Amino acid sequence: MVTVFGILNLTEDSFFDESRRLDPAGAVTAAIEMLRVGSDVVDVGPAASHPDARPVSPADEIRRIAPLLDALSDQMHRVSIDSFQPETQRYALKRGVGYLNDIQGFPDPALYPDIAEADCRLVVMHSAQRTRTGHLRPEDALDEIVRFFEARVSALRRSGVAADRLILDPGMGFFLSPAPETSLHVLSNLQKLKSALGLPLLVSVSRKSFLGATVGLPVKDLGPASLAAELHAIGNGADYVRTHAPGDLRSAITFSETLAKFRS
Amino acid sequence: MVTVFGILNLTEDSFFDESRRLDPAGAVTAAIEMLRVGSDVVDVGPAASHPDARPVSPADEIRRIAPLLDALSDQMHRVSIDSFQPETQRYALKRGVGYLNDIQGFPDPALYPDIAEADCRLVVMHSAQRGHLRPEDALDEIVRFFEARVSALRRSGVAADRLILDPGMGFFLSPAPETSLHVLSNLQKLKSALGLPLLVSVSRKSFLGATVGLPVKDLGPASLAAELHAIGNGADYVRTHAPGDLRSAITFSETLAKFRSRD
Ligand SMILES: Nc1nc2ncc(CO)nc2c(=O)[nH]1
Ligand SMILES: Nc1nc2ncc(CO)nc2c(=O)[nH]1
Ligand SMILES: [Cl-]
Ligand SMILES: [Cl-]
Ligand SMILES: [Cl-]
Ligand SMILES: [Cl-]
Ligand SMILES: [Cl-]
């Protein structure tokens, strides 16, 4: 069984014009449709990853996700909030979203008691931008990721966060290293990571730099390479996938699972 | 190593308007372009596929492909002619195409001595038309079919190393998806039993539509998944509607495999 997270970036190109003004009604419509075809969970991202973007204040993040939580009130369990701001996480916490997705892997223990009371699940992502000899090399990646999760899981578990609420994301692309080889090594040997961690795995390879470096294509021609990467990840222990093309991935999952039933 | 055939259907909706008249210049432009990104080979199909279509005469087939061979004469080894008409096949031989792709599997021996003198390769496709074939009967029938057909080609002088075998997919096997699924799922035994290179064309076929429940133009992703499985199970050639997509997934898969560390 695979659970598909569909990416909803509230600050992507299609949500503003020359007035630099964001469209809340447009995002609500997109999120409803996503949940209708393709996305098991919609992953709402209020922070900008634009090269010139300044940090987004927590208050702006909350104002951006609040209208979306309003429209999805009767299906909170299909909502994930993609944010590293603890105040945004706290706000989404109390409103009862299904998931908190943190690229910093919840490093502030002052938020742990608030998380233990709630029932949401946590996507705990490893980020190698923590520095020793330099960038994360392939031969060290697996041990680094295991030691990272060993420490962060046991910290959350010490504060009352049950283990069955935890989803572990190894990180991909530049979150692992500027070198594509490190992401390729981790993805290819994902099964060994899954066995050593013993908890469900999520990956998000869709449109990442290391795909572009591998096939030599710009970010919007990476749909097919992403699908190949995702199907490979699913076959090697990934239980969750975060992707820009969720309906595409689901229909490929359905074909793969149906085809496996005919193997002799 | 995979060779990707890009489908060029000369009678798809993009190549005619209300004049019911085919546009060869648009197809030439499409062919040159798909060769530039993705397609190792372009599979040129002049025979209609419409539900209300009558058969296409060989003269019309030849008229439709002639401008394409004109535009690709300096790279004929990258050209496959998708036709079952022996007149169209003879014409293509005379202009030295790289491949003859016959969904009837070359059943007319009158053509063999002309093929034997050429140096093209042949895509010999198996079909249930000679229409229900069950999964339990599928593999033995495909093997027995090719054993007779391959021997008959070789005995008329067509060398074995020129042959590419296609099991057929979709309605060429059965109206039910189960037979295509069984054959695709167990493609490796087919390859080892036949011992010749294998081509499959699953792209957009009915059995994908029935498996994922999607119309023919939402089948890109399911097709890519099917294609990647076929490649991992002995397919040396793949005929697809999205050749640039497939080549990019193959490049990623081949690169990823190099990072698998022992056991
Ligand atoms: N869990 C997770 N979330 C992400 N959010 C944003 C981005 C990139 O903007 N990447 C990721 C990712 O790789 N994993
Ligand atoms: N070799 C080959 N050719 C085909 N041409 C047309 C179509 C469908 O129009 N299918 C095939 C196929 O499955 N294999
Ligand atoms: Cl409501
Ligand atoms: Cl999609
Ligand atoms: Cl021989
Ligand atoms: Cl038919
Ligand atoms: Cl093989």
Numbering used by the authors:
A (entry chain A): 1 to 130, 135 to 268
B (entry chain B): 1 to 130, 138 to 270
Sentences from the paper on this structure:
All three Sul enzymes adopted the (ɑ/β)8 TIM barrel fold also shared by DHPS.
We determined the crystal structure of Sul1 in a ligand-bound state, and the Sul2 and Sul3 enzymes in both apo and ligand-bound forms to resolutions between 1.74 to 2.8 Å. We identified electron density in the active site of Sul1 corresponding only to a pterin ring which we modeled as 6-hydroxymethylpterin (6-HMP). Additionally, the plane of the pterin ring formed van der Waals interactions with Phe179 and Ile103.
